[PDB]
Design a protein around this motif. Sequence first.
Motif, short mmCIF file in Angstrom:
data_model
loop_
_atom_site.label_atom_id
_atom_site.label_comp_id
_atom_site.label_asym_id
_atom_site.label_seq_id
_atom_site.Cartn_x
_atom_site.Cartn_y
_atom_site.Cartn_z
N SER C 145 0.83 -1.20 0.00
CA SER C 145 0.00 0.00 0.00
C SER C 145 0.87 1.25 0.00
O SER C 145 1.87 1.33 0.71
CB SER C 145 -0.92 -0.01 1.21
OG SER C 145 -0.17 -0.01 2.41
N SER C 223 4.69 11.75 -4.99
CA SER C 223 4.56 10.71 -6.00
C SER C 223 3.83 9.46 -5.51
O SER C 223 3.44 8.63 -6.34
CB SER C 223 5.95 10.31 -6.52
OG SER C 223 6.70 9.68 -5.49
N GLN C 224 3.63 9.31 -4.20
CA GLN C 224 2.86 8.21 -3.64
C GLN C 224 1.36 8.51 -3.57
O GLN C 224 0.63 7.76 -2.92
CB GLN C 224 3.38 7.86 -2.25
CG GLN C 224 4.80 7.34 -2.23
CD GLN C 224 4.94 6.00 -2.92
OE1 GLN C 224 4.07 5.14 -2.80
NE2 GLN C 224 6.04 5.82 -3.64
N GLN C 237 -9.58 17.20 -18.11
CA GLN C 237 -8.45 17.40 -19.02
C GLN C 237 -7.57 18.57 -18.58
O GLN C 237 -6.37 18.57 -18.85
CB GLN C 237 -8.95 17.62 -20.45
CG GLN C 237 -9.55 16.38 -21.09
CD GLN C 237 -10.11 16.65 -22.46
OE1 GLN C 237 -10.10 17.79 -22.94
NE2 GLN C 237 -10.62 15.61 -23.11
N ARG C 240 -5.55 17.06 -15.76
CA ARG C 240 -4.54 16.08 -16.18
C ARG C 240 -3.23 16.77 -16.55
O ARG C 240 -2.16 16.21 -16.30
CB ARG C 240 -5.07 15.25 -17.35
CG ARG C 240 -4.14 14.15 -17.80
CD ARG C 240 -4.77 13.30 -18.88
NE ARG C 240 -5.84 12.46 -18.36
CZ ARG C 240 -6.68 11.77 -19.13
NH1 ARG C 240 -6.57 11.84 -20.45
NH2 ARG C 240 -7.63 11.02 -18.59
N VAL C 241 -3.30 17.98 -17.08
CA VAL C 241 -2.11 18.72 -17.50
C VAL C 241 -1.65 19.64 -16.38
O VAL C 241 -0.90 20.60 -16.62
CB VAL C 241 -2.38 19.52 -18.79
CG1 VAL C 241 -2.67 18.57 -19.93
CG2 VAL C 241 -3.54 20.48 -18.59
N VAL C 246 1.90 15.97 -13.68
CA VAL C 246 2.77 15.45 -14.73
C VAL C 246 4.24 15.46 -14.32
O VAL C 246 5.03 14.70 -14.88
CB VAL C 246 2.57 16.22 -16.05
CG1 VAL C 246 1.16 16.04 -16.54
CG2 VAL C 246 2.90 17.69 -15.88
N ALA C 247 4.63 16.29 -13.35
CA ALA C 247 6.02 16.34 -12.94
C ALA C 247 6.37 15.20 -11.99
O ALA C 247 7.32 14.45 -12.23
CB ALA C 247 6.33 17.69 -12.28
N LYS C 248 5.60 15.05 -10.91
CA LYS C 248 5.82 13.97 -9.95
C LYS C 248 5.31 12.62 -10.44
O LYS C 248 5.56 11.62 -9.77
CB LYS C 248 5.17 14.31 -8.61
CG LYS C 248 6.12 14.85 -7.55
CD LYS C 248 6.80 16.14 -7.96
CE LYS C 248 7.84 16.56 -6.94
NZ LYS C 248 7.23 16.80 -5.61
N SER C 249 4.59 12.60 -11.57
CA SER C 249 4.11 11.38 -12.24
C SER C 249 3.21 10.55 -11.33
O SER C 249 3.48 9.37 -11.08
CB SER C 249 5.27 10.55 -12.79
OG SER C 249 5.98 11.25 -13.79
N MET C 254 -9.36 9.44 -14.63
CA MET C 254 -10.41 10.36 -15.00
C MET C 254 -11.65 9.58 -15.44
O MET C 254 -11.54 8.54 -16.09
CB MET C 254 -9.96 11.29 -16.13
CG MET C 254 -10.92 12.41 -16.46
SD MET C 254 -10.38 13.46 -17.82
CE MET C 254 -10.73 12.41 -19.23
N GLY C 478 -13.15 8.72 -20.29
CA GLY C 478 -12.10 8.97 -19.32
C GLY C 478 -10.84 8.15 -19.51
O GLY C 478 -9.73 8.67 -19.34
N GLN C 494 1.35 -0.30 -4.83
CA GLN C 494 2.51 -0.29 -5.71
C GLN C 494 2.95 -1.72 -5.96
O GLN C 494 3.31 -2.44 -5.02
CB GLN C 494 3.65 0.54 -5.11
CG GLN C 494 4.87 0.57 -6.00
CD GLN C 494 4.59 1.19 -7.35
OE1 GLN C 494 3.89 2.21 -7.44
NE2 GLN C 494 5.11 0.59 -8.41
N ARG C 495 2.94 -2.12 -7.22
CA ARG C 495 3.31 -3.48 -7.59
C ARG C 495 4.82 -3.59 -7.74
O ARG C 495 5.43 -2.85 -8.52
CB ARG C 495 2.62 -3.90 -8.88
CG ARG C 495 2.85 -5.35 -9.26
CD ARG C 495 2.06 -5.74 -10.49
NE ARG C 495 0.62 -5.74 -10.25
CZ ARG C 495 -0.23 -4.87 -10.81
NH1 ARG C 495 0.22 -3.94 -11.63
NH2 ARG C 495 -1.52 -4.95 -10.53
N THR C 496 5.43 -4.51 -6.99
CA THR C 496 6.87 -4.71 -6.97
C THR C 496 7.16 -6.18 -7.21
O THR C 496 6.61 -7.05 -6.53
CB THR C 496 7.46 -4.26 -5.63
OG1 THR C 496 7.19 -2.87 -5.42
CG2 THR C 496 8.96 -4.49 -5.59
#
Lengths: 60, 678, 678
Positions: C145, C223-224, C237, C240-241, C246-249, C254, C478, C494-496
């Motif tokens: 998690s 990012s988490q 939309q 989303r931008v 978009v920086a921390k991804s 949506m 979406g 988070q899949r590891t």
Amino acid sequence: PGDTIQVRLTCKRKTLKKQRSAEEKPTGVVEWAVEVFNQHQTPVALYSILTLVARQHGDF
Amino acid sequence: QQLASFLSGTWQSGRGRSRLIHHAISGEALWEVTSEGLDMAAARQFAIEKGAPALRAMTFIERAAMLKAVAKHLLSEKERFYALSAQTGATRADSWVDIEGGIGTLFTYASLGSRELPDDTLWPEDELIPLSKEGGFAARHLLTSKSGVAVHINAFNFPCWGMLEKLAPTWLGGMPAIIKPATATAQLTQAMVKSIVDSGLVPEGAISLICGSAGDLLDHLDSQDVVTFTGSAATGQMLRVQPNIVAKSIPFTMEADSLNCCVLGEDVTPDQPEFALFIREVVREMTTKAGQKCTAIRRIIVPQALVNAVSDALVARLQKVVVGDPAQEGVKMGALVNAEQRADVQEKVNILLAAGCEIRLGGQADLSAAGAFFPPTLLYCPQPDETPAVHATEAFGPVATLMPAQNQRHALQLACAGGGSLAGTLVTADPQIARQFIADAARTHGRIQILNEESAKESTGHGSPLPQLVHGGPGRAGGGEELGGLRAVKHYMQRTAVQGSPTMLAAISKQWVRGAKVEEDRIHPFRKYFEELQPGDSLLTPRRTMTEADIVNFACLSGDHFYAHMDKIAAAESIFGERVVHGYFVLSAAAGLFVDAGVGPVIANYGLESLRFIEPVKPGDTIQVRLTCKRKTLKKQRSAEEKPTGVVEWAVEVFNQHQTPVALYSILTLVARQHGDF
Amino acid sequence: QQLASFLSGTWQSGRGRSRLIHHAISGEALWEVTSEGLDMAAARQFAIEKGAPALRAMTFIERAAMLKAVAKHLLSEKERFYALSAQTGATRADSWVDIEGGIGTLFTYASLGSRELPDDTLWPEDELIPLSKEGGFAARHLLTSKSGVAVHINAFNFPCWGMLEKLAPTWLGGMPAIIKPATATAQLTQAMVKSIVDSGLVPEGAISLICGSAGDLLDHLDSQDVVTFTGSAATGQMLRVQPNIVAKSIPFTMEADSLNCCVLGEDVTPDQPEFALFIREVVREMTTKAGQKCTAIRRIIVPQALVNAVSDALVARLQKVVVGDPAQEGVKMGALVNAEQRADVQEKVNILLAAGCEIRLGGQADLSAAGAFFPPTLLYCPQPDETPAVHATEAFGPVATLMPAQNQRHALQLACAGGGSLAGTLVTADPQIARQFIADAARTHGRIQILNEESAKESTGHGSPLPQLVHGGPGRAGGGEELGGLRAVKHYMQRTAVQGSPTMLAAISKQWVRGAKVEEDRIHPFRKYFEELQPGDSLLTPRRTMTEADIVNFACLSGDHFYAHMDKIAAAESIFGERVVHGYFVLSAAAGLFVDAGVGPVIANYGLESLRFIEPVKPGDTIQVRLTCKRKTLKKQRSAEEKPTGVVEWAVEVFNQHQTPVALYSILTLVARQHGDF
């Protein structure tokens, strides 16, 4: 038929053997007293078996 | 020399401001890349209306066989791939990863498509979702292949692998691909694409190529398209805010640069074998492919008492690394791909030296050499918690900084401070330390190798991402996921939850599900060959009355004298109320009812999928079994001597005189085909 | 009146430019929403460092029990939720869906978390992936998690459900949520959040709330974090931008507007029962919630010969729909939520009228009434494939166009021409038409109901998104997916892919791995209770020599007289070479070897996970079984009278005198606990 059966195995008599050679495995003739009984706890078919059990440490 | 671009079925080249590819180990320009004037709309149009229905008309088994055929044809002429990859500055052992890992990725996706994918255009991933008490309304999730193209924008690291690890889930998923390789090494990518196209195996339009900029490709993508990116973060974050991608809402998968860790534990002392394999893992992962791989170790976390031992053993092991020409003997590390990449590595080193330290040959790198040579670099950071430049900047080469930790609490924080990584390593021999490491450090890493003495013998290492393990990572590592076994082919499909009656879902899924219509046609289903079986071919077996003698004979023969089967007293004191028939005897008497005794197309059984015993079976309780065909899924007959066959699944439904389903399950069974194919 | 915002554990309110909530059925303003001057950084900080570790310290079974407890506590005081939802202009049959669908979503996610999720912080989703020859290097995927907030930005349609269908995978996925509802109807959302917080069931920081704009929340996300949007397309939309996203991804899911189709097939004639349930489904779905749900039918595709029949039957069914106050009698359709939403509906109606036609009361709607009423509008488009405004513009109310098709080939194109819809419907009795519809139209629809006479008895319909069916759709809808059963809890994880030795993966996963170390401790594993079984507790059973008499007695007792067991001639010409022991007798004699006969914690078996018979067992072939514990996963003891117990999974590895594994499988078992909890 329908009469359940429960068995009470218990150790009775040990009486080791002297290991007459050095190649022979150390062992003892352990006697067990078997006490079979039913759901009424009455002893149907009580008996006693002899059984050979190997020793851990020999003597000869 | 012209380096073309396979667009609209023909080999074409651009006419405009052309970039040019330098030779890595020497320095001359012997390729040029351009894509100006090439019609990208016509390329996407030819792909969508020529290769997308051709791939979608195939089944998954045929597409896996296509992947295996392309793998064999590309493994046959593999030496020209090494000849083209020697121009990228890599050695033979460094190009061996790039070629053979991609070809083994093709073989692995062929095996995964042959084992767990159906003989259908569609793929149902669920079993059944019951949504009604009567049973006349149910649902299950389908996976239909998308009707668009996959735009793969690769990095300069792995042309062959990095194109070819994305191309197998794309083709196996059911979409045509348009590959945009990085313009620093696109000649190996065009060698790969030409070896694919000049074989007659793939359909036309199923693969495309642009050696140069896309220009007008992203502005023309439909909503049924996907884009996969691998490269720098500054490019991919600007391709995430592209207006057609956010307007039509197409899946953009990004793989940016990451700060991969290799944490050393407190239990590892230098007299143990764990220390030597730790140093060997760090050195091999930092020197393989000249440190130009995305999963390369760049942050070594050691304890404070082990700073000097690691920082001397790494020097004593890395001064043996000879950086020179790959063809001459006694050369371990090759070179970087370009002088521009060498300048990028040196300026990232100069950024890291603004707050770090130095252990070895670092910023001293000759920019005037005829070749992109960079020495192996080991840095040092005495204050890792007070230096954000270590945890925000990667030097994409043989550079890997070292920094201490404080008793496995600071080490987890320094491993998680990378902003989300692509790969990680803990080298311990204590399983509780590994449990505590996965409990905190797996949130930022998409792959963690716990390396010890037992694992280090037959390991693939840390820089070979397995084709059946997730090659992804959150945050700075991009956010997307790749190579997750069959998870990667689901990025190219649409998941549709299809509702209806079970007799409708069975004809949609081409698989009998739970409550569909049956087809009983007076002969036994095990007497049918593969081609004359249909999902729904049922069989209502005769009955068998379970008795006390059945329980006695099975408890004797199996040797299972469990008290709920063989005791009258304890079964009355249990949840069942009295002693019941063995579930394995219900299974065995079921198989006695439905299995035909004669010699037929049924070869072996070897399988049982999901056994659940719902209600107990008593003495005086009859048993009737409903065998019905469920899933056909032929095999491709890999040789000519082997018999043609298929793995037919049967859903077995046992029930009593009250018609309640005791012991419903599913078996696999090998059924020989009538007519072969190979 | 202050509609507050649960931030940093306290009930805070904003100070600034304040929007206000109108009473939908009458017109007065009885709330006002604002969030200006509220520290969003402090709210995110309190959530991440207070309620995130409290959720991450719980197991999945404990978090599913928390979901069930919140479900029961929110089902108890449910009538105040109907009183707050009557302000939204919805009827009792619409507010019943809005409240009970969310509470049943909580019960369903509690059941799915109590059944298929482990008693652990982590969840291994794979079985095992072997990556070596000897078996010392394997891998399996882990799901940990994430350590951040889950910003859910909802729509004005379902406050209760649409908040509460995102909150159960979030809490079950181990993340705390910050809910930003739409400001049109946030009073029911604060009623829900207040009933959650004032119960002591969830930890502090595990849930938050903002009524009004977020302002500074999206500019602070790590990012988490994840953001799950639901609402208009343009706002999603623009979010989303957003540069921090978009920086921390961070993952941005949506859900936007959609044109949900309902296609009628060629087999349906008006004398069939399919026509009546078609008209009933279209009218009920278009009049439920006054067309203010995202799963509402907005396009009806009919055959060309059935234009007049459907266009008469829909009007004859819809003219009996009374649009009025919900508290007065005889009223079926309620009203919209705002007069501004009424103007936003009619400004799309006027766009659809600029290129379509009219059948009923369309733009006739009073824009100054004392209630947000809108009449049921049925439009018409005589040229559907030559009018792009029909397939690109949604009127978000009771409006739905009607348009003809040509023999189920134009119908698929009109279903796919919506740019990617959220849901769809085909009403047929022919299953081949349903197969051709799923083969082309499931690329654009995230959900398709195939409705016939058998399905329509206990169907949930088209405007009840099931919590175990994917609520999504590509393109215009979406692109992101929701409610996928356990697919929805994986977006919050988070899949590891964790590599290493199997004896290390066994302690990382807290579940026994195929080549791990064992713990043999001289006493029988079925004699242990639940709290003293550990994953790794193994038993090496004594041997049993298989013979020809074993094959004979099992083939007699079970009745399985298969030719590879009971024929010397046919088994000589088979793949085995001679007649072999039954696989089910290997199973039965295995269970005779490891099952303790006496009374103990083992209650029932009822299960067998994955049976694969690898190599055949012959006469004169000894058999030895390795019973080892694999997975524990206790149950929460749903009543105080019921016995405390857990479902313990045993991995079973049977082998022969050459120590090669024949018939390795896995069984489930209900094992009683020593100490209870509830």
